[PDB]
Amino acid sequence: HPPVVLVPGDLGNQLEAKLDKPTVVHYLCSKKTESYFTIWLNLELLLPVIIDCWIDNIRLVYNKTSRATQFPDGVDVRVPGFGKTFSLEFLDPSKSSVGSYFHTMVESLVGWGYTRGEDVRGAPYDWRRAPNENGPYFLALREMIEEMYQLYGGPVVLVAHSMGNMYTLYFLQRQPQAWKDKYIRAFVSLGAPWGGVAKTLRVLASGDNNRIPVIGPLKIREQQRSAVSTSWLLPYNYTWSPEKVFVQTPTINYTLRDYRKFFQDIGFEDGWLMRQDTEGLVEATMPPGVQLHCLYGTGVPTPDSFYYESFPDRDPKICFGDGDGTVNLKSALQCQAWQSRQEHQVLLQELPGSEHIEMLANATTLAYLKRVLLGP
Ligand SMILES: *[C@@H]1O[C@H](CO)[C@@H](O)[C@H](O)[C@H]1NC(C)=O
Ligand SMILES: *[C@@H]1O[C@H](CO)[C@@H](O)[C@H](O)[C@H]1NC(C)=O
Ligand SMILES: *[C@@H]1O[C@H](CO)[C@@H](O)[C@H](O)[C@H]1NC(C)=O
Ligand SMILES: *[C@@H]1O[C@H](CO)[C@@H](O)[C@H](O)[C@H]1NC(C)=O
Ligand SMILES: [Cl-]
Numbered sequence: 001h002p003p004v005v006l007v008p009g010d011l012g013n014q015l016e017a018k019l020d021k022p023t024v025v026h027y028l029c030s031k032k033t034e035s036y037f038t039i040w041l042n043l044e045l046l047l048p049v050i051i052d053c054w055i056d057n058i059r060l061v062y063n064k065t066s067r068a069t070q071f072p073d074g075v076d077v078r079v080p081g082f083g084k085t086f087s088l089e090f091l092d093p094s095k096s097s098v099g100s101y102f103h104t105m106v107e108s109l110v111g112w113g114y115t116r117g118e119d120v121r122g123a124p125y126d127w128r129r130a131p132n133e134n135g136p137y138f139l140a141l142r143e144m145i146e147e148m149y150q151l152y153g154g155p156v157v158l159v160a161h162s163m164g165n166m167y168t169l170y171f172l173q174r175q176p177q178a179w180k181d182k183y184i185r186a187f188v189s190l191g192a193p194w195g196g197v198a199k200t201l202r203v204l205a206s207g208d209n210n211r212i213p214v215i216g217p218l219k220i221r222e223q224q225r226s227a228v229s230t231s232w233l234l235p236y237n238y239t240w241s242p243e244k245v246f247v248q249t250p251t252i253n254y255t256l257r258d259y260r261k262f263f264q265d266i267g268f269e270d271g272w273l274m275r276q277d278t279e280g281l282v283e284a285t286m287p288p289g290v291q292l293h294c295l296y297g298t299g300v301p302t303p304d305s306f307y308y309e310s311f312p313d314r315d316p317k318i319c320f321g322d323g324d325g326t327v328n329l330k331s332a333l334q335c336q337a338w339q340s341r342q343e344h345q346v347l348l349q350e351l352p353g354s355e356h357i358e359m360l361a362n363a364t365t366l367a368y369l370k371r372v373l374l375g376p
Contacts, residue, residue: 001113001373002157002185003148004120005141006088006102009162009191010229013124014080014087015040017057021074029053036078041091041099051215059226060128062270067277069133069228079124083144088122102161104361105369112374119152127163130232130278131170138171145183155185157373158290161360162326163229165192170281172288186291188372190365191356193327194334195239199303201246201254203230205266205312218313231271232278234259238285239330249311266312287338292346293372294335295365297324297354304328326356 016036024031026049039045045054058077060069071077081087089106092099106120114120121144125137145156160168168187172180202208207221224230235246235256247254247262254262263272302323306316322329332348339346349368351359359365 001119002154003152004109004114004157004159004373005145005148006085006105006120006122007158007160007164007168008088008102008122008124008127009160009164010127011040011091012088012101012127012161012164013122014038014091014093015058015126016078016080018076018078019057019074021072025052025056029056036076036080038093039077043092043096043098046212046215048214051219055219055223058128059223060228062226062228062273064270064273067273069129069226077126079126081122081124082140083121084117085120085122086116087124100361102360105159105366108366108370109373112370119148121148125167127229128227130228130274131167131281132277133228134167138174141171142175149183155183157186157188158184159188159190159369160192161190162356163193163233165189165194166233166282169194169288172290173283173286177289180288180290184290186293186372187288188293188295188369189335190295191297191324191327191359192294192331192335193233194331196233196235197327197331198235198246198305199326200230200234201262202303202306202316202318204234204268204271205247205262205306205308206315217315225268225271228274228278231274232281234275236279236284239334245305247306247308247311247316249308285337285341287342287346289342289344291344292335292338292342293349293368294332294346295349295351295359295368296327296329296332296335297351297356297359298322298329299353300325300355302326302328324351324354324356324359 017039018036019033021031057075062069085106089103090099091101109120123141125134148156158168203224207217209215209217209220242257245253245255259275260272263269301320302325303318304321305319308316
C-alpha cells in the first residue's frame with residue numbers, strides 16, 4: 001500500500017501557545033507561561049469571560065505596512081505534531097469526542113496495515129493563515145513527501161478535508177509536473193470548497209457562534225475576522241455568478257464583485273486587504289495535475305445567501321441550497337471542469353446525505369479510500 005499524507009481543514013489540528021504578555025484583558029488571564037499549552041482545542045478556554053483571554057491570544061494582528069499578520073505582543077503560537085497523526089486525530093488532547101476529527105479514519109488505516117508516524121503522516125498547519133503566510137509549511141510538506149517516497153519505495157496518496165484541499169491545490173499548482181508524476185500517486189479530496197463558500201459572508205458580517213451558543217456571535221466575530229483564511233474562502237467568480245447576491249439588507253445588496261464595499265460597510269477594512277493578499281493564490285482554472293478523486297456531499301441544506309433586517313450586528317435569515325451543510329454543491333463543478341484540462345484521471349463521487357464533518361468517519365467514505373489504497 002502506498003504512503004499517505006493527511007491534510008486537515010480549518011480548525012483541523014491542535015495549536016499551542018506560549019505567553020509573556022505585557023498586559024492582559026482580565027486579571028483571570030495568564031500573563032506568562034513557562035512552556036507551551038494547548039490553545040486549540042481546550043473547551044475550558046471558551047467559557048464566558050475566559051473566552052476574552054483566548055480571543056486575545058489566538059487573534060491575528062494585521063499589519064498594513066508589511067501586509068502580513070503577526071501574533072499579539074508576547075504571544076507565540078506553534079503547530080505540534082507535523083509528520084505525526086495525533087494532532088489531527090484529536091483536536092482536544094484530553095481525547096474527548098468533541099475533538100475527534102481524523103481518529104476514525106486513522107483507526108481504519110491502521111487496521112489495514114498502516115503505521116502512525118511512518119507510512120501515514122499528518123501535515124498540520126496554522127489554519128488561521130492562508131497559503132501566502134505558510135511558505136515554510138509547503139517546504140516541509142515537499143520534503144516529507146520526498147522522504148516518504150524514499151523510505152517506503154513509492155509515490156504518496158494525499159488525503160485532504162475541507163480547506164485542506166485548497167492548501168493541497170496551492171501546493172500542487174506550484175510543483176513541476178515531473179515532480180508530481182514521480183512523488184504523488186493520487187489526491188483524494190474530501191469536501192473541497194473549490195471556489196469558496198457562501199457562509200463566510202455571515203461569519204465576517206455578524207459572527208458565527210453556532211458551535212459555542214453560550215458565547216455571543218459578536219464576541220467570537222473578533223477572532224473569526226482576524227483569521228486570514230476566512231476572507232480567503234469568500235466566493236470566487238470561477239464557481240459563482242458575479243451577479244449572485246450573497247447578502248441582502250434593507251438598503252444595499254452584496255455580490256462577489258462588492259467585497260470592497262462589504263468590508264467598508266461592516267467596519268473591517270483589513271478584510272479587504274486580506275482578500276487582495278489571497279484572492280490570486282490559487283490559479284482559477286489550473287488543475288492539480290494528479291489523479292484526483294473528488295468526493296462531495298449532497299442532500300444537506302447548505303447556506304446560500306443571507307437576509308439582514310439589521311446589518312451587520314444582528315443574525316440574518318438564511319436561504320439554503322444543496323451541498324454538505326458547509327460546502328455549496330457548485331464547488332463540485334470545479335472538479336468537473338478539470339477533467340478536460342489534465343491528462344490524469346478525475347473521478348467524481350457523490351455522497352448523498354453525507355454531512356461535511358461526518359464524512360470523515362463515514363463507512364462509505366472509508367470503503368472508497370480502502371479501494372484507492374489497497375486496490376480491487
Ligand atoms: C509592522 O511591520 C513593520 C514592517 O515589518 C514593522 O516595522 C512594524 O514594527 C510592525 N508593526 C507592529 C505594530 O508590530
Ligand atoms: C474574477 O475575479 C477576480 C478576482 O478574484 C477579478 O480580478 C476578475 O476581474 C474577475 N473576472 C471577471 C468578473 O470576469
Ligand atoms: C437587492 O436585490 C433584490 C433582488 O435580488 C431586490 O429585490 C432588492 O430591491 C435589492 N436591494 C437593494 C437595497 O437594492
Ligand atoms: C454516510 O455516507 C453515505 C453516502 O453518502 C450516506 O448515505 C449515509 O447516510 C452516511 N452515514 C451517516 C451516518 O450519515
Ligand atoms: Cl491517472
